[PDB]
């Protein structure tokens, strides 16, 4: 079966226990809650429904909370009517939130709009529909030249390519949503619009103050500043979400593919999970089959080395959610099938790399790893083993979180008290899992006489 | 500058000499004539305009004739009105060309429709818009069950996934178009819907009977039968066009990416040019910028190893042809920039592989190759050299055809009569080309005391 | 310190406890008792003296009993006077032991002399001093033509190059000497003139009949038949002694070097100990320093990969025994210093090869191995690790025997009852041994949940 | 056939044309004239006889003149009688040449004996037979303590281990012998006791002053100072002779093997010929077969990579000269047979390394090299090609000198005027040589459009 993991955004058409059970059957591994919409009762019910399905079926899934994040948006227009902007005309943005807009001026929600912009910068409105060039800044106004014809509606997103925007790391709504995440015991938080290390630290401190210190932070990289600061963002985060659609509006289009490839590569080296998201199978919101191009896009992200792929509207509100998951899983299995190990100085990396190499040389279908916080399992996954990884842990949070790592099957166990006990138990559970059978070789990895989080032992057993 | 070559379909908005000159400036290397449309005067004028621009500017380009090919199409409907087909209804195709269609039956243009199909086969209509399952075949009728709702218009294409269709290799119109190609001295013919070796042989014999034995045949692989017979098709052809859009309708969608990757890989090994085509930058027919996904699709085809990428409607009839070529070239240069050589038993391969390796070890910016029919230049290109390839030939047809090979700069010369003369002339032309300068190392490859088409000499010179 | 081990033949000048202690100080690892001479009281006293020194100093050494073996020798001559044989003359050997020899005929000790020889065979007398060609065999006579001038003395050795000699595997005296060796608890038996597998088996069955089932048999390869049957001899033996001087008389002289190299390499591959012996430092029987040629010969044997080197007359009866051992150790250390690991499918070899590689990648000075019969320690030594091997065993005989393996330090312990206990103890003993210090990395190898003799675990610890 | 070349010292028993022809038949490649003995008429006659044999048989050989060199020797003793010196006694050397020696004092031939020695230095007499330690130096006396018992004869050699001796590079007799060598057109001069760069330069300037600028200088490395200065000596020389016997007296005995190995490896890297000499087959001066130890020593020198091996007394004055040469050739062929190429930034090394690799990948039995001074042929030999090297040259001296390089067959030709002419001629000569046959692949190496001594072309041809 596939190794790549599937994140599904859950919404009205997929929130019932019946639908969720069918989603898991088709290959869903992680439920994404998009807090751009819905209230707390709605999201809490979805969590309840999934956990009901999990306990009834004994299947394991993880829950990811995806924040709305801070934004720059235009505001209202006279009579609520769209206005037609003409290439070459003058157009003005104002930070005065009380102003109602027309064909010459509109208000924006961000007070720092005048401060952060410079003459010559580009202002993009409505997912890049309309481009403008700043010609002057005076008082609370940014005067611009419209670069292309377009119709401006109300409440449209604004992008400032290449600008360092002094928006807070968290909207006030985001802060309450994170408390809800701690209350609900979510496994991951995907933090929107991460631009710098200090953004991640604030989210870390906020989660810690509400008992969520074990919740993993997935930073969403969406603009050039986040790209420039990627190394420090990754270091402070537990993982990364590559938001291709936002990057497509924020950086030169020919760069987006290499931003994805390099971010995936760096996450792999850092033993941190990476999700490829947005613009995956969007056409399946309306159609029962994806496009050739969409299928290729998904497969190339897997070949790039992503841990997981994500469905958005096509699983949350679209008309063919089950078809989308199913064809996603089919693409995953077809692509995982043809990938090879990557066997390219620390004790943990020496032992994990050697264990994968030993497994391949002995045709081992399974690597068994003892792990407390999941690091051990991710250190083996780094080398793209042909073998499946059976991760044994006493930590429920770790067991849920490892559901997102490529090719990892987590298993919650009663604590193992010695290295020999780990070999005895792992052999039994290897057989019980159906992932290996009598006579198969399995490689077992653990830490002996060391603090948690260090791997220093590799062991080969016949079942 | 980029190494990947760009094929541009030329049409009304790009056929003037002024536009063509701007197309070349932006990165166009090969003009495609799509004989699905236009008459002979129209295509002949485009050839004349390009050759005018070539002689005036001294720039080199190639001309590719892309055949319409044989087809299966539905026919007319009552009153010319679309009809609404309902999932589950019975629907019948008839080979009786005299029948006017309605919501229950329509005629098809192919007499063998009844012969080639079987109960259980899938019939796709209008680029897969409507799917049907054959339930019975009687006389001149194929009775089907409609699988999904759809509106059937007139004269729509029909696809039969996984069926071996006994259509001729060439439509009658194709045969006359090939004579026109010989009359005009085109450099390539892209042959539509190639399914088996004998299809290529017929085209070869037809071209030979009209003085076109030196025209290279690019076989378009569009369905499962062509995939199954790919090895023999490639062997008989001079190159391959990967028609992704057609494959998307003809084979399981998760397979299309690997059909592309494997066909490119095999062409590379066979020293035969490969073009990746269709569904590249289609959105630019209407928009001045492509989508993030389109840009990624193009770049991944380059990383796969394609020689060339192709523009269709976006350069022929679209509103932003120059923008499309320019961003295509930008993607090409950005992607070529980060690719590495591939240095993985015949004398020619031993010498060409060694020459590339020597060039890389000595930081040679240029490999100079003496070639008669172009094979030598393509044998060096096989290893993806960092260095540019300067191909010297007395053969005008070869000089034009090498314009399509990745990273090859062709140069027509007066015949060289000895190996030492080749070193003297190549050094001078190396400097004149501006591709290398005084003090640079260049590696020079040629055949000494051997029949044309064998490479057995490698030589290193300082300019 | 050196890794190559030194076998010293002990005699009158080196048998006292005082001399033995200084021999160990200078680098002696194994005492060889040459049972060609000395009676049981003398050899028993030497064994007692070594064990006294071992108990007093806490040093570990092994005891090797070297059998005389079967021989063919000429007999006596008239008046005990030498005779001069002439090239081309007729000379006859007779199996009649009652015959007194002269310049025309002499007796030999072996009844099968007539049976095993053929017309055309070469008969060599006195370490090849005199060659003869069989011209006829009649009754108890072998008639020969003398091939070269020489002086024949009494009681000279006879060699039959390329002939299969049907001598018994054991002389009658050898059988009693082996029983004495079992009584005394020797660690190795070196069996002279091993020609075939059955010779090794016969010695094994004799030892088993007198409680010597754990004594390792080192087969001495001395002639062409042993070379021809080497693979089966090695398989049946525990180790090999390369007797270069004897081979130099039995096979073409240009082949001896490659016979030594081939045999050493095969022993390494089989994880079986090999000794290089004879014509090592013979000149030091009379001189206090060896020859340039001798020193080079020894060093090249070490570079070939021998486990051990052996002193014969120069440590047993010569005038400079301590100088011989000391310069030998100097050669060993000087040559071992510049040798590298050899890292090249069984579980044991996969784990042991990986453990050596891990040790080298982490600059581990020490590999700790748990072993019962020594196989595990010898499996690590196979890869010529930079690190010293500390072999922990509960088996006293194994501890002695491992003294002969290159780069192994054995240590007798109280049995370890678990894998974690093995790591705790090995770390302590690593520090106690002085072979590693606080902060050093050590790699520990053992078998977990497997029968003795299987290695399936590798573990990395910081001291 | 062997690739390693054989230098034979010619003397009374091997000087006739008849013997020389049989010496060449048996494997001799180079004649060494040891000018320690013989007068000019004798050496001139030997040169004449070899050239007669060469012209009659068409075989190619080289002539090497080996200088006596400077020495320190003791002088005469009272009554010409040996004296016995006692360990611990006082013994004095005096530079007063008029003094007649006895058991307490003897004269030496070198005035600088007092200057170059220091209190604590070791004085060795008679190939290290007797060691003495300087205790004081006063006037023309070196007072020593005898370190070991020994018998002092007259006119014995003196060695000063680790001392820089200020002897002139050339004895007065050496200067005349070198002029004679220039007059006679010898191909090599072997310069004895080279200690430093300036010694090589002095010999060079003498040869240049008498028309010997093309004679190659082989520096004999014989003591520690030469070892210390080896890199600069090699740089200044054309080749090296490793004098193992002399080094065995001057440096620690365990170091001699690695001094030989290091020096051979460095010569290979520098593309300069190396000879292994002294203590090769000395026992064959009296015996018709060598010792096991001698044969092994020679073979290990070949495996180390020496170009040539040298016979001294055993071919010049011994009783079995032809047997010595023959068994030497047998050892050479037996050892060369099992050696492999060594394929490891200049243009010459890139092209030559690639040519060897191409030859091996294509099973080419022959590499043809165009060379003026021999550098090109020696640059190919550096990689130990399986193929034989056919070196085409117009230079008679180069043709002779290349006889000493491993695996090179030189061939004198009429000048080639182009690269294509070189391929035509080399193919013909490849076939004429019997080293390759119809259908074989040959690789041809030369310089095109470059000054002599640059190699920049590699070419592959089928015969």
Automatic annotation (TrEMBL), chains A, B, C, D:
Residues 349-461 form the Pyruvate kinase C-terminal domain. Its EC number is 2.7.1.40. The gene is pykF. It comes from the Bacteria. Keywords: ATP-binding, Glycolysis, Kinase, Magnesium, Metal-binding, Nucleotide-binding, Potassium, Pyruvate, Transferase. Homotetramer. Pathway: Carbohydrate degradation; glycolysis; pyruvate from D-glyceraldehyde 3-phosphate: step 5/5. Residues 1-325 form the Pyruvate kinase barrel domain. One of its GO terms (molecular function) is kinase activity. It catalyses: pyruvate + ATP = phosphoenolpyruvate + ADP + H(+). One of its GO terms (biological process) is response to stress. Belongs to the pyruvate kinase family. InterPro entries: Pyr_Knase (IPR001697), Pyrv/PenolPyrv_kinase-like_dom (IPR015813), Pyrv_kinase-like_dom_sf (IPR040442), Pyrv_Knase-like_insert_dom_sf (IPR011037), Pyrv_Knase_AS (IPR018209), Pyrv_Knase_brl (IPR015793), Pyrv_Knase_C (IPR015795), Pyrv_Knase_C_sf (IPR036918). Pfam families: PK (PF00224), PK_C (PF02887). Its cofactor is Mg(2+); K(+). This is Pyruvate kinase. The keyword Transcription does not apply. It comes from Escherichia coli. The keyword Magnesium applies.
């Amino acid at each position: 079966m596939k190794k790549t993991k599937i994140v599904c955004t859950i919404g009205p058409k997929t929130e019932s226990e019946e639908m969720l059970a069918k989603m898991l059957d088709a290959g869903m591994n992680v439920m994404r809650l998009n807090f751009s919409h819905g209230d707390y009762a709605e999201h809490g019910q979805r969590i309840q429904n999934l956990r009901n399905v999990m306990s009834k079926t004994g299947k394991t899934a993880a829950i990811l909370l995806d924040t709305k994040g801070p934004e720059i948006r235009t505001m209202k227009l006279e009579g609520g009517n769209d206005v037609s902007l003409k290439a070459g005309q003058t157009f003005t943005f104002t930070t005065d939130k009380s102003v109602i807009g027309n064909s010459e001026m509109v208000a924006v929600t961000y007070e720092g709009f005048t401060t952060d912009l410079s003459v010559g910068n580009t202002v993009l409105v409505d997912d890049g529909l309309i481009g403008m060039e700043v010609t002057a800044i005076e008082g609370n106004k940014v005067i611009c030249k419209v670069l292309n014809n377009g119709d401006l509606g109300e409440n449209k997103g604004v992008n400032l390519p290449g600008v360092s925007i002094a928006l807070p790391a968290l909207a006030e709504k985001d802060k309450q949503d994170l408390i809800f995440g701690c209350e609900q015991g979510v496994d991951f938080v995907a933090a929107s619009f991460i631009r710098k290390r200090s953004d991640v630290i604030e989210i870390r401190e906020h989660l810690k103050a509400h008992g969520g210190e074990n919740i993993h932070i997935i930073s969403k990289i969406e603009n050039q500043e986040g790209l420039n600061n990627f190394d420090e963002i990754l270091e402070a985060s537990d993982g990364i979400m590559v938001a291709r659609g936002d990057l497509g509006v924020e950086i030169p289009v020919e760069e987006v593919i290499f931003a994805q490839k390099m971010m995936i590569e760096k996450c792999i080296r850092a033993r941190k999970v990476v999700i490829t998201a947005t613009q995956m199978l969007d056409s399946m919101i309306k159609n029962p089959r994806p496009t050739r191009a969409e299928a290729g896009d998904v497969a190339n992200a897997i070949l790039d080395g992503t841990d997981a792929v994500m469905l958005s509207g096509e699983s949350a509100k679209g008309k063919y959610p089950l078809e989308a998951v199913s064809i996603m899983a089919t693409i995953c299995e077809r692509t995982d099938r043809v990938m090879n190990s990557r066997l390219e100085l620390r004790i943990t990396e020496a032992v994990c790399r050697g264990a994968v190499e030993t497994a391949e040389k002995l045709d081992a279908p399974l690597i068994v790893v003892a792990t407390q916080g999941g690091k051990s399992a991710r250190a083996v996954r780094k080398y793209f083993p042909d073998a499946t990884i059976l991760a044994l842990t006493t930590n429920e949070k770790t067991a849920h979180q490892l559901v997102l790592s490529k090719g990892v099957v987590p298993q919650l166990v009663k604590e193992i008290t010695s290295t020999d006990d780990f070999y005895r138990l792992g052999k039994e559970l290897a057989l019980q899992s159906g992932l290996a059978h009598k006579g198969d070789v399995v490689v077992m990895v653990s830490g002996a006489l060391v603090p948690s989080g260090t791997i220093n032992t590799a062991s080969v057993h016949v079942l």
